[PDB]
Coordinates of C-alpha atoms in Angstrom, one line a residue:
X1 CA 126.3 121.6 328.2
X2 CA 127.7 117.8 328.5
X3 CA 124.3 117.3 326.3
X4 CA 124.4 118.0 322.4
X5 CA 122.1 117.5 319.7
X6 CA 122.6 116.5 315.8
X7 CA 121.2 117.8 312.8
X8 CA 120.4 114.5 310.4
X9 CA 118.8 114.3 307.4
X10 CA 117.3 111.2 305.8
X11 CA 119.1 109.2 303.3
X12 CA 117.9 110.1 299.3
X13 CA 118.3 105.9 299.3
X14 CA 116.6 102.2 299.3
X15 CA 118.7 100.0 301.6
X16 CA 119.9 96.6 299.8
X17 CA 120.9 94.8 303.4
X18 CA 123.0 91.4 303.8
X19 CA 119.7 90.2 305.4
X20 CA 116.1 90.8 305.2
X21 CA 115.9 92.9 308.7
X22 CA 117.4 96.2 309.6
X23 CA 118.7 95.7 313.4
X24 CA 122.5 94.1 312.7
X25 CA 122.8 94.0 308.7
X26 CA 125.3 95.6 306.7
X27 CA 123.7 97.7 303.5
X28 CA 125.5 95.4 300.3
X29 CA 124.1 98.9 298.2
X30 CA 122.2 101.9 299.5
X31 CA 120.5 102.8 296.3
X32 CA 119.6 106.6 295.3
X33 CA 115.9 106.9 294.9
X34 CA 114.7 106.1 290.7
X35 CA 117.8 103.2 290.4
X36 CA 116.4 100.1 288.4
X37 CA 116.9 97.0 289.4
X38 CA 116.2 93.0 288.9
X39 CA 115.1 91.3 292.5
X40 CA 112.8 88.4 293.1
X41 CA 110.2 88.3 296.0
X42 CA 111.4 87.0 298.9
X43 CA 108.5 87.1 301.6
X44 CA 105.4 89.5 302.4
X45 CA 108.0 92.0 303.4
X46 CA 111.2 91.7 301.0
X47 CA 112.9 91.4 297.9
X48 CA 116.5 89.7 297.1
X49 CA 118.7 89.8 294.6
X50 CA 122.5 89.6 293.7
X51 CA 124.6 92.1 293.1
X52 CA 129.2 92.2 292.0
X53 CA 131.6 93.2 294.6
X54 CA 134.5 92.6 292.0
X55 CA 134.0 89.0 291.0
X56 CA 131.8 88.0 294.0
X57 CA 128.3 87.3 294.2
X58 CA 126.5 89.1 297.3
X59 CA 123.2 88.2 298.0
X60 CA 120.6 91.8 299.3
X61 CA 117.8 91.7 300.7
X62 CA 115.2 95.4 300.1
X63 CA 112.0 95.9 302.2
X64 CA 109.3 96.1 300.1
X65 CA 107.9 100.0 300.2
X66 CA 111.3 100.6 298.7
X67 CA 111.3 98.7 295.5
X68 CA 108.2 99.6 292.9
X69 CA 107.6 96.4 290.5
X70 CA 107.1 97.9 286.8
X71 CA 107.2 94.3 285.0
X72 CA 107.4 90.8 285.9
X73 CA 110.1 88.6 283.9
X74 CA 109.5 84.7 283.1
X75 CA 112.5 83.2 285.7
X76 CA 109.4 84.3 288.7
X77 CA 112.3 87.7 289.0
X78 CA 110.8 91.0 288.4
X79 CA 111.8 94.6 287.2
X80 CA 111.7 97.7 290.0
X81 CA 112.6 100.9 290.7
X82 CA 114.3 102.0 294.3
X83 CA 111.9 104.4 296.3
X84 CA 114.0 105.8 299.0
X85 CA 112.6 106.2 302.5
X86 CA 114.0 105.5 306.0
X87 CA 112.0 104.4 309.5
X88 CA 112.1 104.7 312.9
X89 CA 110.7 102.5 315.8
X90 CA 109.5 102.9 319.0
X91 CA 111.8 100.1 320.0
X92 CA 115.5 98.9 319.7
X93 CA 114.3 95.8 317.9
X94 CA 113.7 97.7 314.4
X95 CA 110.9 95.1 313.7
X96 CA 107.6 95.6 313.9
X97 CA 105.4 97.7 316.7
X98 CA 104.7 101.3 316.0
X99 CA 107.1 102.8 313.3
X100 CA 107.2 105.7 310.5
X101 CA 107.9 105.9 306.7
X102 CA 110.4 108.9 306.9
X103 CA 110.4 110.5 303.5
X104 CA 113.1 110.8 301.8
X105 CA 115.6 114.2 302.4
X106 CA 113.4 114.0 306.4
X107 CA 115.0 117.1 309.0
X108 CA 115.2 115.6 312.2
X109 CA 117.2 116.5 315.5
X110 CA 118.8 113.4 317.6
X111 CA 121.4 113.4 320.0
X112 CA 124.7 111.2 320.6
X113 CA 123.7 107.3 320.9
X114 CA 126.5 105.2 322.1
X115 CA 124.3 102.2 321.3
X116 CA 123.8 103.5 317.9
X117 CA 119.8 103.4 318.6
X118 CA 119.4 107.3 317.4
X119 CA 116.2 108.9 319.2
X120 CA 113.4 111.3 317.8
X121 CA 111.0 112.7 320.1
X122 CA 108.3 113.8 318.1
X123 CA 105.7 116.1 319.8
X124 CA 102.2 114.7 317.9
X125 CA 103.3 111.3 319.8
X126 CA 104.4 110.7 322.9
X127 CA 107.5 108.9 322.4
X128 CA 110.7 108.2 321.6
X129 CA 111.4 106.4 318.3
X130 CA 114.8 105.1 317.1
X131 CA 116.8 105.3 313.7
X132 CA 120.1 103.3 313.0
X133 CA 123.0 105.3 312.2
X134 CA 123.3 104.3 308.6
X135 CA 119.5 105.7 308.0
X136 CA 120.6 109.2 307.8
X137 CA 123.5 112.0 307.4
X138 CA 125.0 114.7 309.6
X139 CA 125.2 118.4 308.4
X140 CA 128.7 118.6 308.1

């Protein structure tokens, strides 16, 4: 049995990445699900805003199905709150195609990715999608 499985769950988290994409950026905050923040609109797709790592300004960037708008402030900024959810896609370019919303605390099974492309077979579909390893946690 050279072949293994995981047991992952889905992150209870908005992801707050160094750029507005989610193949090769680093999370600056994963958010738990209900946090309030201040971002701005960024494009169709994302938010931005800054954030402290000690004394240092760091720029985010939050897909926008994870950030509810509850008022907009006068500086064009507005007020949110995080709603946590993950994705997959049925391609190694995380951008576009055919993906899923995974909910929040999602049960999956995937199996060791040395290219840290994580796949989910799901039976309804016929296909492989992919999840990026900082998406989810291991049992354990």
């Amino acid at each position: 049995h050279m072949m293994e499985n995981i047991n992952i769950v889905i992150k209870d988290v908005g992801y707050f990445q160094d750029k507005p994409q989610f193949l090769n950026s680093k999370s600056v905050r994963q958010w738990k699900h209900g946090t309030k923040v201040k971002l701005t609109k960024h494009n169709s797709h994302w938010y931005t805003g800054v954030v402290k790592d000690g004394n240092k300004s760091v720029r985010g960037y939050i897909y926008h199905s994870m950030a509810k708008v509850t008022s907009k402030n006068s500086d064009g900024s507005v007020n949110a709150t995080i709603n946590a959810h993950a994705f997959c896609w049925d391609n190694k370019k995380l951008n576009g195609g055919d993906f899923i919303n995974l909910k929040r605390g999602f049960k999956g099974i995937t199996h060791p990715a040395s290219d840290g492309f994580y796949p989910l077979y799901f039976a309804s579909r016929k296909k492989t999608f992919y999840i990026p390893r900082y998406m989810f946690d291991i049992k354990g």
